[PDB]
Design a protein around this nucleic acid. Structure first.
Length: 87
DNA sequence: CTTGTTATCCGCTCACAATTCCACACTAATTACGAGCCGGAAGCATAAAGTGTAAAGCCTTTTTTGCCTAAAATGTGATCTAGATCACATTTATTGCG
């Protein structure tokens, strides 16, 4: 129900906001890889290998960083490790 | 003097255990719990057309039974001729020999 010319304008500016945020979150999911292996000692030999253990650990950190609020009393080193041990 | 290829050396990843049967005896650790949720099935009686089972109800055919009796098979024993029986004693005829 939109013009083929203007419909592109809506999406072209969405790739700008998601890009400035994506690259900005690539620095938090790289310097915090030490916390993933830290709590990865509670689910070692059980049924899944260690190589596939930090798999659900890295995906969890990338989820918490997105739903994180710097304007909140709780820090990140505690709020992020919540979704990690959940995956 | 500097440069190259080549030879020797090392540590490394790599490929690589072969005399031949059986018997007896023995053996395993670990991820926080509780409340709420949807799940399968506990096997419940239901009910129907459909199916295949299970009583025994008179017919017909087979098979054992008891039957009757007309006609054929079956002892009676004392006398009497045609038959049989043993053992191993002595007499007889067979083919040749000389």
């Amino acid at each position: 129900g939109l013009t083929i010319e203007q419909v592109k304008d809506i999406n072209r500016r969405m790739s700008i906001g998601e890009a400035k945020a994506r690259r900005a979150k690539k620095e938090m999911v790289e310097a915090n890889l030490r916390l993933v292996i830290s709590i990865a000692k509670k689910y070692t030999n059980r049924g899944l290998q260690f190589l596939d253990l930090i798999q659900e650990g890295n995906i969890g950190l990338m989820k918490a960083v997105d739903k994180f609020e710097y304007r909140r009393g709780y820090k990140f080193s505690t709020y992020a490790t919540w979704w990690i041990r959940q995956a």
